[PDB]
Amino acid sequence: PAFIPYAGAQFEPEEMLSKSAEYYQFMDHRRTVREFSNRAIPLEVIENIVMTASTAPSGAHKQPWTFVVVSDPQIKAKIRQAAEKEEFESDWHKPFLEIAPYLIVVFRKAYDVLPDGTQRKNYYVQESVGIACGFLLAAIHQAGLVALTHTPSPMNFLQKILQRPENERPFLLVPVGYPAEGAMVPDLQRKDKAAVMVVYHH
Amino acid sequence: PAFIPYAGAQFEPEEMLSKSAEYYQFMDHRRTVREFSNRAIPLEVIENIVMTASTAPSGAHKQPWTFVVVSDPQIKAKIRQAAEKEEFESHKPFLEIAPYLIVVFRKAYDVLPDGTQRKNYYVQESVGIACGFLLAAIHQAGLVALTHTPSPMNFLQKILQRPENERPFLLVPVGYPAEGAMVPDLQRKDKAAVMVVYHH
Numbered sequence: 062p063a064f065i066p067y068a069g070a071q072f073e074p075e076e077m078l079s080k081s082a083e084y085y086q087f088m089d090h091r092r093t094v095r096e097f098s099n100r101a102i103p104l105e106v107i108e109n110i111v112m113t114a115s116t117a118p119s120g121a122h123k124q125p126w127t128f129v130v131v132s133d134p135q136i137k138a139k140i141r142q143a144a145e146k147e148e149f150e151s152d153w154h155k156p157f158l159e160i161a162p163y164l165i166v167v168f169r170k171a172y173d174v175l176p177d178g179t180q181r182k183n184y185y186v187q188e189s190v191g192i193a194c195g196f197l198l199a200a201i202h203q204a205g206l207v208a209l210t211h212t213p214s215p216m217n218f219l220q221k222i223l224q225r226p227e228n229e230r231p232f233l234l235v236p237v238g239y240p241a242e243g244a245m246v247p248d249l250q251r252k253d254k255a256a257v258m259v260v261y262h263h
Numbered sequence: 264p265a266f267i268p269y270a271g272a273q274f275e276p277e278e279m280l281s282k283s284a285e286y287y288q289f290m291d292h293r294r295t296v297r298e299f300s301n302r303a304i305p306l307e308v309i310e311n312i313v314m315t316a317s318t319a320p321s322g323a324h325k326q327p328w329t330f331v332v333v334s335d336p337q338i339k340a341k342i343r344q345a346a347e348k349e350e351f352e353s354h355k356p357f358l359e360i361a362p363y364l365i366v367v368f369r370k371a372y373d374v375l376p377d378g379t380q381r382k383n384y385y386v387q388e389s390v391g392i393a394c395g396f397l398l399a400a401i402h403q404a405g406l407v408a409l410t411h412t413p414s415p416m417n418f419l420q421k422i423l424q425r426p427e428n429e430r431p432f433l434l435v436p437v438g439y440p441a442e443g444a445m446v447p448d449l450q451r452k453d454k455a456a457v458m459v460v461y462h463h
């Protein structure tokens with residue numbers, strides 16, 4: 062139950078504007094990419110990126126998440142086929158799950174498990190893990206990499222093949238890597254502030 | 264349905280190591296602050312922060328979120344009261360002190376002009392991610408925040424006058440930190456406790 066003074070670099074309202082403005086333009090350049098280069102990336106980059114995600118706030122500091130980093134070609138092949146076969150039942154074509162150097166499979170912990178077997182339930186897990194995934198993608202973009210935020214599909218396969226315990230569930234599938242040379246993204250337009258931001262003034 | 268070549272910077276692995284490490288340590292310095300300063304912040308600062316959050320990915324590009332920014336000391340004080348009464352069942356000065364409350368709402372669905380309801384996809388995680396970008400933007404701006412439960416939901420829904428398709432997702436005061444701002448001496452999990460790596 063110790064305490065420490067907050068060590069945070071703050072800036073005058075002037076420097077806060079350029080910071081917030083420049084950062085918005087930087088993040089606005091981020092786009093979901095679905096065509097990856099199989100170019101190699103040092104694991105330490107991914108480790109830092111995952112670690113950067115783990116710095117996110119969490120309900121009661123539980124940090125109820127497990128980041129399963131996957132570079133093994135055989136596992137990625139298994140996961141791909143499972144994803145294609147599940148989406149095939151209703152593109153379903155998903156070569157990016159094998160071609161991307163790393164699959165970051167995010168799991169959410171509904172509860173922690175202690176040595177004595179008892180279960181200490183976590184709080185606001187969906188929110189906490191979601192925020193961490195936000196930090197993940199923000200870090201991926203900071204590294205100069207691209208990603209494909211993807212549904213954790215199929216959940217049961219991902220659960221087994223990664224051998225994660227029953228307290229955990231797949232939250233998000235995130236292939237990561239360089240973009241392909243001929244990579245293209247859809248000409249999408251993001252909502253303007255009038256459509257997303259309501260303001261109650263004095 | 265047009266298409267654009269991806270326009271993004273590429274670094275060598277080493278320049279990636281640097282930036283990935285440089286960004287981790289910067290983000291490690293972020294802490295939940297519960298003691299705020301009443302120092303006024305330009306509305307435009309938080310406008311950028313909210314739009315930064317809005318650049319987040321979303322299921323089917325629906326962007327199912329509404330960021331309700333509250334500076335009105337009167338509504339901030341009413342939100343404070345109801346929050347305390349709710350948490351009383353078993354204390355929140357920051358909800359008034361912080362110059363802004365960013366109440367994030369999630370949209371279960373969109374309502375078309377013809378009154379039809381077009382359902383959204385993976386709203387919880389989409390908005391959660393967006394809230395991640397929000398806190399990243401806040402930290403980038405040298406500001407601090409208190410990620411907080413959206414309680415009570417019915418009250419926040421009513422007083423902020425949001426439609427049925429929306430529900431409170433998170434409440435976050437935003438502002439400068441207090442002078443003698445103390446944070447709990449917490450220690451984050453290490454690589455071993457949160458990261459499982461499958462090599463070849």
Ligand SMILES: Cc1cc2nc3c(=O)[nH]c(=O)nc-3n(C[C@H](O)[C@H](O)[C@H](O)COP(=O)(O)O)c2cc1C
Nearest residue numbers: 092093210211212319320321322323324385388389
């Ligand atoms: C929770 C979530 C799940 C997603 N699942 C998929 C998916 O299964 N397949 C896919 O191609 N894209 C998926 N996406 C990516 C979105 O379609 C994409 O972010 C959206 O089209 C907007 O594009 P942008 O992120 O580049 O701005 C997902 C995004 C989110 C946030």
Ligand SMILES: Cc1cc2nc3c(=O)[nH]c(=O)nc-3n(C[C@H](O)[C@H](O)[C@H](O)COP(=O)(O)O)c2cc1C
Nearest residue numbers: 117118119120121122185188189294295410411412
């Ligand atoms: C989804 C979510 C809900 C939270 N709700 C509260 C809350 O209701 N009250 C509070 O004091 N802190 C709340 N927090 C903040 C956490 O308690 C805090 O982030 C945690 O103690 C770890 O501290 P850190 O974020 O500085 O690393 C919440 C955080 C998250 C992610």
